[PDB]
Amino acid sequence: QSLFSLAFGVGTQNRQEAWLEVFYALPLLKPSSEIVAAVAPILGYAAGNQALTFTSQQAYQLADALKGIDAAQSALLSRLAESQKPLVATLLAEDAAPSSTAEAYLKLHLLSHRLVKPHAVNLSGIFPLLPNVAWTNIGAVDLAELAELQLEARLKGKLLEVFSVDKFPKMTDYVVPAGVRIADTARVRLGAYIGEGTTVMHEGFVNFNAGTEGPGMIEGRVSAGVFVGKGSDLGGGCSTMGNIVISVGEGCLIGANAGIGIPLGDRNIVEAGLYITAGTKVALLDENALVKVVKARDLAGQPDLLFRRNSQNGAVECKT
Amino acid sequence: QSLFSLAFGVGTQNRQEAWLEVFYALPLLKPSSEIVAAVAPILGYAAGNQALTFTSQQAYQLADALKGIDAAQSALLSRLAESQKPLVATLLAEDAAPSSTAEAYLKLHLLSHRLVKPHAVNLSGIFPLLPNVAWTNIGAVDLAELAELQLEARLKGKLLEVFSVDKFPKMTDYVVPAGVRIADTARVRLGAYIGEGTTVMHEGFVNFNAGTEGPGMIEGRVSAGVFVGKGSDLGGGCSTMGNIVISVGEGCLIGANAGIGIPLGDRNIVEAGLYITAGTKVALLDENALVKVVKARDLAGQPDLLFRRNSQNGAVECKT
Amino acid sequence: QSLFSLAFGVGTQNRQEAWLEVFYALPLLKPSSEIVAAVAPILGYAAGNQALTFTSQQAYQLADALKGIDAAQSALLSRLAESQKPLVATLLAEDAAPSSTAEAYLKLHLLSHRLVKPHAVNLSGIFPLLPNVAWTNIGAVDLAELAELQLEARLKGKLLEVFSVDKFPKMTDYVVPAGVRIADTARVRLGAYIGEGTTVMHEGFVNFNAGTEGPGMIEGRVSAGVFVGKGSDLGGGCSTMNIVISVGEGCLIGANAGIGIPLGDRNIVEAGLYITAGTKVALLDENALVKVVKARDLAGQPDLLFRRNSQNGAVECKT
């Protein structure tokens, strides 16, 4: 059938052969049937969603099979054939809950290469497939092996720098999409979608399955599942809630340290320091005369609203 | 006597023989007198709190003295004999105000290894014993020597990366305790206690002599001296105060960008955005009828409190 | 005329001979005419603001022209002579709008080396001259080139770590000024001015053309153009933002506070309080009410204590 996705990866395994991570240089969404037919017999792929380990020899074969069909992939395979690290072919017949770590990594790659957008893909059950890993300067290292490797580096006057201990590596160690700035890359997870024209500044954060249409200036905290529309600036220290699908529309503005726990419609402005939850009582104002006191949940998705705290009596107000 | 602690360390010295840092693989709290009597004569240890430099030969001899008593410490010492860097034995009669950099480093390891909790160890005067150092990809570097190594690195088209300039290195460059996640390890200082079941997210920060019993979700800032009880979740960019001892009890919830300048008893909730210091006048409420106006200090360490801001008139309230 | 600046730089080029960055070890402000008199003709400098690429040969001649004149610079050039990277001599006649990346970098170094203070130097138009680059453990890398090198590292079980993708690099990969602590150096841009006695903690941030007089404790966000006077502490996650927003001497800014007006000396601001020009504040005296003004009219005033009333949510200023 028409496969959902396929990618040839080079990854890391621990001493018991558990996959810790996979690097895919050139993942493909909706690969052509020609590529799939050319590669399936060599890998032993028949059907379904499979993570298939392949040898250096198979890499040479696959590189030949795709000379004539896809040069970019062929060229990748020739490099992969000389790898000092294990290779895996991830062929997905369908977009379903991931069943292996390799697949988990592939889907996070589809997001960060921008080939798919937040919510587009099934990520259910991803957490148990992504091992807790020490991310270090020499690569992913198993937690049960790390202590020894740390000591060993010290004996040489070197340092094994461990810059993250988590289930998700930082995005930019796998892919840097075009038209993007990320001041401090520890704050953008693999699986984040950083739209063309987005600057993530140092206080900005973007989790997996979340991000920006682009352009925009992101200095706040975009949580898992939160998408942000084009031309929307997030002030330093602000937050989106990590239930209805939270999002930020196009043209929006979000002051520093502000917190939004409901969807914001296009062209919304939010005041610095202000917090809005679903049950936040707001005074709805007009052209600014009072109308009525409603909960923020009932303004969810509305365009051109301006959320500000009244500095004199502390009342939260929405000027239409 | 019953030593308070001992540890065999490999460290780094500058050109004038001042210690910059020490790495202890296997620090011991209350070592057995068997180990001490096996080690003391070979080092020249009589009494007191001493940081004794030892030679490669002594390392062999110490391993040889501890084969049969403690095989882990023995295995460690034989690795240290093959070191390219200077060794130090730190034997402490008593938990006292630190007198050497080696001793300052050891006490920080006792915390981060979870062998003692915050407040259990004496850290008075630690700041002048911890040199201000440049932490780089090649290790710790004396600030006076740094410019030369920076320039020289550039001449080869390489980079000497300088990721911190401080008295406290990051905990994970020394130890990753079991059952822990720390998304950005630059925000956890050596000397932090990160309990089993803790997830420090990217905005989470944990200073020395501070941290979590575990489990927990730390997306806020745990200041020095601040301990956080089990099952207590700190929101995005919230703060504790770094006087009475500021702590957070068990099963607490602290909302994003809230501040707590008073100790919180068990099962306390604090609303996101609310800032409560000792002299914060709170409208104590009941099963939500009013009662009186008290200062937050008087409600310190009380169980099952709910601190919030009135979104209609700005008043700070506590709901029992 | 008298040169405003000169520095001998080592840099990184991509394949279309574009300059990604330059590392100046010993930048000189107002270099003696002696030093200049020796170096200009060997390089072919006539006048104006010039970034003259120069060779390994010239480095030997320029070390020789400065033997007996400036020992630090002579030693610098003998090392540059052995460089495996393209070298640039950056001679500036005046402090004018930057025109090249070499010059842009240099102007950031003058700030970070503390040789000039924020606002004292012309950076108009610097943004386009600072190419967007992946900052990696191996050095600055062209974005167009990065994917190949990322792959190649992985084939050897290595990692090409990309720790920043920005037009500015982190200050500390170029210079660490004396008497300074910076917990997380990803949060201080080349171009920042971190004055003696400053500790920037982990939640602290300083942009370029901004910083601290020193001494100070900066746990908050210091935006471009913002300068913080001596003895002023900034709390965790606090923010500074047209009038040039400054913080005076001996100020205290609470956690997550926001100052959108210039703060006079010895001002205290409560944690979580967000004050902008339009913020309406209950002005209190010696604490009886006096009137309600906008914060803009309290801008620059010394000895003010800003706090939010916990009983009615009013912003209050106690004089």
From Swiss-Prot, chain C:
Annotated positions binding Mg(2+): 203
GO terms of molecular function: 2,3,4,5-tetrahydropyridine-2,6-dicarboxylate N-succinyltransferase activity; magnesium ion binding
Subcellular location: Cytoplasm
Superkingdom, taxonomy of origin: Bacteria
Regulation: Weakly inhibited by D-2-aminopimelate.
InterPro entries listed in its UniProt record: DapD_gammaproteobac, Hexapep, THDPS_M, THDPS_M_sf, Trimer_LpxA-like_sf, Type2_DapD
Pathway(s) it belongs to: Amino-acid biosynthesis; L-lysine biosynthesis via DAP pathway; LL-2,6-diaminopimelate from (S)-tetrahydrodipicolinate (succinylase route): step 1/3
Residue numbers annotated as active site: 219
Subunit structure: Homotrimer.
Family, per entry: Belongs to the type 2 tetrahydrodipicolinate N-succinyltransferase family.
Protein name: 2,3,4,5-tetrahydropyridine-2,6-dicarboxylate N-succinyltransferase
